[PDB]
DNA sequence: CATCGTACTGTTACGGCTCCATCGATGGAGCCGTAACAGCGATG
């Protein structure tokens, strides 16, 4: 049984630790749905990686466009080089 | 304005296969004409 390993020099700063702790506590409690009111440039990808690493559960991320999905996949590969990151988009060129 | 859907049709370049049109001369032998060659008698 493999585990999640995260490598990143950039430590959380500001409200990131509090948001991560709140999300982890809510997931552990068993809340069906939650919202992250993260502004642009605040590092939502870092918070997502942190909660995924803490929870240690399979994760499916849905994006509304291919470019954002590719950027998220590359970011998750960067944070998780040891771990496994996949990519499931449309293969129809036309 | 972006996203999705259980290997898609029609028309062109290019290489290999096949069918069809279009295209005298040299040596040997025989013959003719011309030049070349060979081939008993009587007297002192």
Q: Which nucleotides of B are covered by protein (CB under 7 A)?
A: 2-5
Tell me the structure's resolution in angstroms, rounded to a single decimal.
Answer: 3.2
Task: Show the tokens assigned to A58.
Answer: 């399979």
* A83: three-class secondary structure by DSSP: coil
A90 Cβ contact list (under 8 Å, min separation 6): A66
A64 touches strand B (CB under 7 A): yes
* Alpha-carbon dihedral sign for residues A46, A19, A13, A40: positive
Please report, rounded to whole angstroms, the spatial distance between the CA atom of protein residue A94 and the C1' atom of nucleotide B10. 17
């Amino acid at each position: 049984m493999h585990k999640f390993k995260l490598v990143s020099d950039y430590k959380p700063c500001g409200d990131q630790p509090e948001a991560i702790d709140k999300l982890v506590e809510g997931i552990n409690r068993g809340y069906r749905g939650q919202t992250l009111l993260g502004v642009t440039g605040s590092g939502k990808t870092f918070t997502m990686a942190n909660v995924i690493e803490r929870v240690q559960k399979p994760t499916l991320v849905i994006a509304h466009n291919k470019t954002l999905a590719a950027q998220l996949c590359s970011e998750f590969k960067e944070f998780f080089p040891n771990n496994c990151v996949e990519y499931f988009v449309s293969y129809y060129d036309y």
